[PDB]
Amino acid sequence: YIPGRLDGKVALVTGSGRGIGAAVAVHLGRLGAKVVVNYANSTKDAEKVVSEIKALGSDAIAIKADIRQVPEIVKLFDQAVAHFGHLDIAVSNSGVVSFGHLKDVTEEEFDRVFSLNTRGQFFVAREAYRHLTEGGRIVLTSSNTSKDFSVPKHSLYSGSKGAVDSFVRIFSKDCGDKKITVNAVAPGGTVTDMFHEVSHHYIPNGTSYTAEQRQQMAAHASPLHRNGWPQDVANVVGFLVSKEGEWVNGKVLTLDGGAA
Template identity: 45%
Template sequence: MTRLSGKVALVTGAGRGIGRAVALRLAEDGATVAVNFRSSAADAEHLVTELEERGGQAVAIRADVTDLAETKRLVEQAVETYGRLDILVSNAGIEHFAPLGEITPEDFDRVFAVNTKGQLFAAQQAARHLRPGGRIVLTSSVSATRSVFHHTLYAASKAAVNSMVVNLAAELGQRGITINAIAPGGTATDMAATNAVHYRHPLLDVPLPEWEKMHCALGRLARPEEIAAVTAFLVSDDACYITGRTIEADGGFF
């Protein structure tokens, strides 16, 4: 497919999981991809090699999106490398589960620094370089609008993302740029392998696979490439009249 031919995309948190799948899909659709990572250098370099072996162009750029100076450098390096920026997919994020009485100020700062602050300033810095037709996709979660036991801090950090895209849409729309968010449900990544059990209410004594069938219309976790497919739609011309929206890709979570 070539619907993103000539476009340059920056994907944050692209070394693993959903971010990796997004980078692969955007490259498959013709985009040149800047692969951001913070600590998973080997994964990011392996992804770049894979993209190049498939005939694409890619570069790995280390940056911590919780640091504005590093985010600014990340975006500028992508632009300097390829001469332009057309797409930002802000995917970097961290999980958190804890009851109210155990949430600390340090937890709050750490979770919001990545999931909220990091995404806001990634959008800010990317928007400085985007032209009319530019696309920004942030990453929310179905937890932002669902009640999940002990998930308050994480859910709040993602609910803020939903509000950001609603409010930034009008501002960026004046420049012909769209901004949306994608809210995945449970997705088969290493993060899910670690945290999926926490989504089950502690009083519900049901094996995790059965719980997934009970709470998802499709009865299974998403594959990362399925989330990537929705992201690829949002950054394409097919989604040119969609902005300020959070798209839930959750398999019918209830």
């Protein structure tokens, strides 16, 4: 047995096609877990991630699910257990971003956001509790915008994650009857191929700066003067889902490199 490692464990990771989720899936594999690469859209991308994990020496399988549909969350978890025999760890990176002044937010947008970010993650936790081995791990994704960062015209998204913060604190109480810990990670601005299409929303008069200037401004918000990267979040998830992360339970960890 090697401390910090996940040898002999089985982990399920949602939102694995891209960005943060992909880095998390690969990292848990690097740590020695077999990985269910759950994803929402591109099967080719997901199989890419599977292939990286196998190249590292761990087994993986891509299982698609629309996490807005609770019946698909149930089948995802059933299939995860049937394939690998058991499931120890469940990490949700499922979510969508949204912007707009309160006055302009529609019913349809509210539902688009809450169905995935809040309702979807809630039922990922339910199904993880139901399927997990004793002593397991659940990690959901919040955001620095929930409590630590105030962005005008970002109320809907901020509240979608505020819900998750409260969920995990109470989930840790309920899930203690299988000795499963429940936490959330709350990333700040993290660079992916999508960062550049939305970074203007986070800066006053953002469209009057170039993408590169906006990335650099995001970098300077941390006193370390660099951007957050998907590996930064994976590193912390990896610790939380390890044996050694056990005493962190019912908490939300803001991962912004010291910006707040």
